[model samples]
Target: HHSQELLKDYIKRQIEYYFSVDNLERDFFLRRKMDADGFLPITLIASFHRVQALTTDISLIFAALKDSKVVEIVDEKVRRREEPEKWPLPP
Candidate 1:
């Protein structure tokens, strides 16, 4: 139970934070990876050591993420369910 819950919450918070105005504003590598629509590969998210500490299986990460309200996964990409439109211009 905690395993699934852990997977769910960690992915949600990490991914949500990654898309936030505060974090994304300074996260240049992440900023560059975003698509025109603000999507990034779930592969990229799943590759993080902190995240992989929970599990390396992207499908589990994908499944747990389905319940997230702050972010979304689609077409193998992930993004905020709602955009802030507040970040500075990209390089």
Candidate 2:
């Protein structure tokens, strides 16, 4: 049980880190969007493909996290970050 908890935490942190601006810019698709926004993103898709392949190998780790309710938590974090002032704060 303790191992599972640790794994969950690791997966959560990995997901958050992977989606951060610095990391997301590594992906060609995302980098293009950032570039169009007048920001400089990474110029190499090779590294992105390598990372994607590695993540694919551990896809089940993410699935397990989703089963533990981490998905909704991360999704909410992403939504809040994407549109901070669009929603009213909870009292």
Candidate 3:
């Protein structure tokens, strides 16, 4: 098997973690980056150190998450398919 498959999985996982309920509530910068409709450019996402270290090629990022269940990808942006519906612990 190719290593790319694993890298793609990791890219998707990291992005998912960024949008997790705990993270979404705590990450002010990320929240601001997300527009009212909850969209952020893949360019921004790829710029994150974790994702960039793996692969910076925009095409790879797109191919990696093309079938993502957690995030929806448009022409150049990505966003959660659904908002975090569960309540969280005291901040």
Candidate 4:
């Protein structure tokens, strides 16, 4: 269907928009840390308007990225090591 193609194209454009300078500046500090270790963090900060549609597409894309093990969602409340060696020593 043409609509499906259009949706896909829209999603692609949204992703490209996320990488733009203005948007990147919004999360520059977080992105800087991730970039140092070859990890590109794709953050989705949704606004009140059109949240359902935005999150729906973002969830689909995030699911795909998760399947490939290219990304891991970080929780702001708890910090965890990505590898055994990165774990902190017992106090």
For model 1, residues 1-91, the per-residue Cα lDDT tens digits are: 8877777777667766777768775888876777777777898888877787878877778876787777777779887777633432464
lDDT (Cα, tens digit) per residue for candidate 3, span 1-91: 3788888888888888887776777787777776666778889999999999988878878987785888788789888778632322222
When sorted by TM-score, best at the front, the candidate numbers are 3, 1, 4, 2
Off-target runs (Cα >4 Å) in candidate 3 are 84-91
Quick one: best lDDT, which candidate?
Answer: 3
Whichever of 1 and 4 has more TM-score, that candidate is: 1
Clashing pairs in 1: none
2 or 3, which is superior by lDDT? 3
Best-to-worst ranking by lDDT: 3, 1, 4, 2
- Computed on alpha carbons, the lDDT of every model, listed in order, comes to 0.75, 0.39, 0.77, 0.39
Model 2, global lDDT: 0.39
Over 44-79, each residue of candidate 2 has an lDDT whose tens digit, in order, gives: 211355444434434434443454421232421222
**C-alpha lDDT (0 to 100) for residue 52 of candidate 3:** 91
Question: Model 4: what TM-score?
Answer: 0.39
Clashing pairs in 4: none
Q: What lDDT tens digits, residue by residue, belong to model 4 across residues 35-88?
A: 333244344322223333655655545443333321244432111124312322
**Can you tell me which runs of candidate 2 are displaced by over 4 Å?**
29-80, 83-91
Clashing pairs counted in every model: 0, 0, 0, 0
Runs in model 4 with CA error above 4 Å?
29-38, 41-91
